[PDB]
Scaffold this active site. Sequence first.
Site, PDB file in Angstrom:
ATOM      1  N   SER A  61       0.793  -1.239   0.000  1.00  0.00           N
ATOM      2  CA  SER A  61       0.000   0.000   0.000  1.00  0.00           C
ATOM      3  C   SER A  61       0.835   1.304   0.000  1.00  0.00           C
ATOM      4  O   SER A  61       0.326   2.364  -0.366  1.00  0.00           O
ATOM      5  CB  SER A  61      -0.934   0.004   1.230  1.00  0.00           C
ATOM      6  OG  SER A  61      -1.012  -1.325   1.769  1.00  0.00           O
ATOM      7  N   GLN A 117     -10.572  -5.253  -1.415  1.00  0.00           N
ATOM      8  CA  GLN A 117      -9.859  -5.871  -2.518  1.00  0.00           C
ATOM      9  C   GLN A 117     -10.742  -6.039  -3.753  1.00  0.00           C
ATOM     10  O   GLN A 117     -11.955  -6.190  -3.640  1.00  0.00           O
ATOM     11  CB  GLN A 117      -9.368  -7.286  -2.113  1.00  0.00           C
ATOM     12  CG  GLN A 117      -8.607  -7.397  -0.783  1.00  0.00           C
ATOM     13  CD  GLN A 117      -9.391  -8.184   0.309  1.00  0.00           C
ATOM     14  OE1 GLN A 117     -10.624  -8.083   0.422  1.00  0.00           O
ATOM     15  NE2 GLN A 117      -8.667  -8.946   1.116  1.00  0.00           N
ATOM     16  N   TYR A 147     -10.935   2.282   4.133  1.00  0.00           N
ATOM     17  CA  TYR A 147      -9.725   1.982   3.365  1.00  0.00           C
ATOM     18  C   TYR A 147     -10.041   0.885   2.327  1.00  0.00           C
ATOM     19  O   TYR A 147     -10.629  -0.176   2.645  1.00  0.00           O
ATOM     20  CB  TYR A 147      -8.610   1.519   4.297  1.00  0.00           C
ATOM     21  CG  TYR A 147      -7.415   1.055   3.519  1.00  0.00           C
ATOM     22  CD1 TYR A 147      -7.134  -0.318   3.388  1.00  0.00           C
ATOM     23  CD2 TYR A 147      -6.600   1.978   2.841  1.00  0.00           C
ATOM     24  CE1 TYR A 147      -6.062  -0.771   2.581  1.00  0.00           C
ATOM     25  CE2 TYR A 147      -5.524   1.547   2.044  1.00  0.00           C
ATOM     26  CZ  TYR A 147      -5.266   0.167   1.915  1.00  0.00           C
ATOM     27  OH  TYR A 147      -4.244  -0.284   1.088  1.00  0.00           O
ATOM     28  N   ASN A 149      -8.421  -0.931  -1.574  1.00  0.00           N
ATOM     29  CA  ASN A 149      -7.519  -0.924  -2.745  1.00  0.00           C
ATOM     30  C   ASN A 149      -8.299  -0.691  -4.054  1.00  0.00           C
ATOM     31  O   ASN A 149      -7.754  -0.137  -5.028  1.00  0.00           O
ATOM     32  CB  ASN A 149      -6.758  -2.250  -2.825  1.00  0.00           C
ATOM     33  CG  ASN A 149      -5.740  -2.383  -1.702  1.00  0.00           C
ATOM     34  OD1 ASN A 149      -4.647  -1.813  -1.764  1.00  0.00           O
ATOM     35  ND2 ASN A 149      -6.107  -3.111  -0.656  1.00  0.00           N
ATOM     36  N   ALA A 315       1.565  -3.304   3.017  1.00  0.00           N
ATOM     37  CA  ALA A 315       1.883  -4.698   3.152  1.00  0.00           C
ATOM     38  C   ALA A 315       1.491  -5.498   1.916  1.00  0.00           C
ATOM     39  O   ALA A 315       0.611  -5.099   1.149  1.00  0.00           O
ATOM     40  CB  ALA A 315       1.152  -5.255   4.383  1.00  0.00           C
ATOM     41  N   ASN A 340       5.458  -9.456   6.633  1.00  0.00           N
ATOM     42  CA  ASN A 340       4.382  -8.559   6.966  1.00  0.00           C
ATOM     43  C   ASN A 340       4.150  -8.655   8.499  1.00  0.00           C
ATOM     44  O   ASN A 340       3.421  -9.525   8.950  1.00  0.00           O
ATOM     45  CB  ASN A 340       3.132  -8.979   6.181  1.00  0.00           C
ATOM     46  CG  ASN A 340       1.916  -8.144   6.533  1.00  0.00           C
ATOM     47  OD1 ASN A 340       2.037  -7.097   7.177  1.00  0.00           O
ATOM     48  ND2 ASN A 340       0.737  -8.606   6.114  1.00  0.00           N
TER      49      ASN A 340
END
EC number: 3.5.2.6
Length: 358
Positions: A61, A117, A147, A149, A315, A340
Site C-alpha cells: 500500500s 480488494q 480503506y 484498494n 503490506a 508482513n
Amino acid sequence: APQQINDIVHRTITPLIEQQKIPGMAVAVIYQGKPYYFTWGYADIAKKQPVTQQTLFELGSVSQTFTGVLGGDAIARGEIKLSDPTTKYWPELTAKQWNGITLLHLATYTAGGLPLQVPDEVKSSSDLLRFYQNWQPAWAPGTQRLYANSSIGLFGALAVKPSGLSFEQAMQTRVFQPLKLNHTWINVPPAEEKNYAWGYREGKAVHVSPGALDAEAYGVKSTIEDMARWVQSNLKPLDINEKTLQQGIQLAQSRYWQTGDMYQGLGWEMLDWPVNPDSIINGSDNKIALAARPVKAITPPTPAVRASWVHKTGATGGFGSYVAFIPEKELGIVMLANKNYPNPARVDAAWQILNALQ
C-alpha cells in the site's frame, strides 16, 4: 553516521527484528535532509543473499503515495480535476449509484464503501467494468472513509486516461525519472531480479501475485535508497524542478477529510505534530480491525501543514513497509521488511526513532 542516529536506530530495530522474527530489513533515516542507511539479515534465506542498499522490497500500500502524487501531477497539468465525476473518465460506468461519486472520493476512500480488494476473478477490463457497475454502496459519497484498494486503485487508472499513457509509463516518465528513482519498478525487470528480495509468509518465500489494478494500488518495488529519496522529495517539494510534479506532491499532502485525529491526503495520511504513538495507531490504518469511520470534509482542503506527522503503512503477503516524515523538522524514516509484521510495532519503532532525533 552521527552516533546518535546510529545508536537509536540499532537500539530500536534490533529488538524489533528479534521479537517479530523478521528475515531481513532496511532502514533509512533522513536527518536535516541527508539520508542514513541501515540493513540487517537476508533478502533470500535459502540462497543466503543479504539485504543491501540495493535490495528491492515490495512496498504494498505504500505504493499509493506514488499513485496519489501521480494523480496530483495530473491535476497540476490540467488533465483531470478532483471535483470531476468518475463517469467523466469512464463513461461506460452508467449504473446510477455512481452519480455524485468524484475522483476525490476514489482517491480518499470516501466513495461509499468500495471493497478492500478487487476480487481475484476479475481479470479483463470488461470484468473490471462489471465489478464496479455491480457494486452497491452502503453509504452516500463523502460521508464515511473505508480503506480500500479498489478505490485508490480505480483513481490511479482513471487519472492517467487523459495522458494517453499506460499507468506504468505515466509513473516512470512523470514521477520516477524526474526524481531519479532509477531502481523503483512496477514490473521488476529480469536484469534486476538478483536484487529482488523474497517475502516470507509462514516461512515460505513469496512474491506478490498479479491482480486487477495492482500497479495502481500496491505494485511498486523499491530500494531503501530510492525510498529515502522519495521521502526527501516529499519533505521538500520546493526543491523539485518539474513544476507539475512539485505541485502534485503538494496536492497529495493537502488535508481533504478529517476523522478523529487523522487527516486524509492523496495516498498520504497525516496527524498534527506533536502526537504520541497510541494516537497515531488509533488514528490510522491498522492491519487488525478494518474500520468504517465517519468523515468531516475540510472545505476547502488545507494546504500541506509543516507541523505534521505524514505517513503510510503498507503490506503484501510477504512484506511490511512503513514511511513517516515531519516536514518542519526535515526528518523522516523508511522501514522495509520482507515479512508482513503488525502495524503497531512499525509505528512504535518509527516514533521511538524520530522522537529521539527531534
